[PDB]
């Protein structure tokens, strides 16, 4: 409250170590259907469906201009990669296997990292 503070953790290396992070996301092998945004011409139903489309690339600009207030708000949007996946493809796919297993590799880099 007013004049009543909990001790400051260090904040000021979270700017790197979620670029680092985001770098091993960038360099899985099953990163790809995350790279770049879904193509809204080219993907019927889509645009209508998923609410706020994300990917890797979209995340890595947010990162790069200070677009993001703090580490929480960088992981909505990795997690947000991840649920719009499972909301449009099936469980046994590709691609739904793909995020199912970044989501995995992104939670364990999240907690080692910062838990």
Known sequence: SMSVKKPKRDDSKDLALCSMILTEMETHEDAWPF?????????????KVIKKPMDFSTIREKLSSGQYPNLETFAL???LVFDNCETFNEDDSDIGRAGHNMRKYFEKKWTDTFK
């Open 77 to 79: 949007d990795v997690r």
């Open 35 to 47: 790279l770049l945004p879904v193509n809204l011409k080219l993907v019927p139903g889509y645009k």
